[PDB]
Amino acid sequence: AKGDPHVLLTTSAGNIELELDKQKAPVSVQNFVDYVNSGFYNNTTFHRVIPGFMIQGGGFTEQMQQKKPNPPIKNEADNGLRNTRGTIAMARTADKDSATSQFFINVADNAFLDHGQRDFGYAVFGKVVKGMDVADKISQVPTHDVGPYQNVPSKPVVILSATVLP
C-alpha cells in the first residue's frame, strides 16, 4: 500500500499517482521503477479494461503493437497484500513467475486474484493515492465485443508519460 516511491502516470484521460510498497514488494517495485525510468511505459496503453473490475496496461503501444519487455520477475503475491480497490498488481500468464511489464489497477475488490492454497495469485505492489476517479473512467470506455479481444477498447487510453516523483 503506502510505501515510498511515487510514480505519476499521465494519461489521455487524466493523471494517476501511485505509491509503491518497497518493503512488501521489493522485486516488483524495482522492476516497475526500472521500466518507468527507461521510458518503457511512455506511449503504452490500457489495452484491457473490464467495467467494475480493473484496467490493465503496460504492454502495447498506441498502434496495438506488443513491446519487448525485460526478463520476468518472481511472484511476490505471498506478501500479504490483497487485490482491493485502488491497488496495483502485476499481470502474468500461466506460470507464477512470468510477470514482466504488464500491470493492472483494481477498481473493485477482486479477492479471487489473491494468493491462496490453489493458485499463487497476483502480486500487489502498491496503491493509487490520487486519480482513482480517472481509473474508474478508463474502465468504462467502449470496447470491442467479438473474439478473444472483446475487452480491448475501441480507443485505448494512452499513458503519455510515466515518471518517478521527487
Which CATH number do you get for residue 76? 2.40.100.10
Tell the residue number behind the cell numbers 515518471, with chain if given.
163
Contacts of 91 (CB under 8 A, 6+ apart): 56, 58, 59, 99, 102, 103, 104, 122
For 146, the domain range is 1-166
- Mark residue 96 as left, alpha or beta (left: phi above 0; alpha: psi -120 to 50; beta: remaining): alpha
Rounded Cα distance, 45 and 19, in Å: 20
* b/e 122-150 (16+ beta carbons within 10 angstroms → b): bbbbbbbeebbebbbbbbebebeeeeeee
- List the determination method: X-ray
Domain count, the chain: 1
| 62 contacts 157 by C-beta, under 8 angstroms | no
Task: Report the C-alpha gap between 149 and 19 in whole angstroms.
Answer: 30
